[PDB]
RNA sequence: UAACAUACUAUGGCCAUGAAAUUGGAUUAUCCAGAGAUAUCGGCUGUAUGUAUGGCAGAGCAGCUCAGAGCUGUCA
């Protein structure tokens, strides 16, 4: 329930952005509050991901599924290998 | 209108920028996308039995003369 509930609501109040790209660039421009990487993701992003985030302090979650579960989780359509939390309003996880 | 010379175009793949849900794109068929689709006065690259010029008209071809030389057209 943790983390369906979570990020249903943190889409719902919410910013974020999906996709390798968006979640580097919000790394980078410091905009990236939390971020989310599946088990399936390749590894070399992994590690790459895990390394842009220890390096600019954010808190990496690690994702108990695979694509779809992460998507679905988005209540988006597509599958994502790694997400970024920008703002959730109502959503503990982000503080603590 | 030869090989060959130079410059351009050629079914694909890449690079930016930006991300797509009232999901879109696309083939005759499949198929692709947040593992980034579509889209930009965008950009890069690969293959000619393509185009232009050189070769080349002087050659070849078709006609017409002169008593071996000569003339005309070979176009769009
Ligand atoms: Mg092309
Ligand atoms: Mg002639």
Do not use: W
């Not at 660039?25 to 939390?34: C, E, F, H, Q, V």
């Not at 302090?57 to 790694?82: D, M, P, W």
């Amino acid at each position: 329930d943790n983390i369906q509930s979570k990020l249903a609501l943190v889409m719902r109040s919410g910013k974020a952005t999906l996709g390798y790209k968006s979640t580097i660039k919000a790394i980078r421009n410091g905009t990236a509050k939390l971020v989310f990487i599946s088990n399936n993701c390749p590894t070399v992003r992994k590690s790459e991901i895990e390394y842009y985030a220890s390096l600019a302090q954010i808190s990496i979650h690690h994702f108990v599924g695979s694509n779809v579960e992460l998507g679905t989780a988005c209540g988006k359509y597509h599958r994502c290998s790694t997400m970024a939390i920008l703002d959730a309003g109502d959503s503990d996880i982000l503080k603590t």
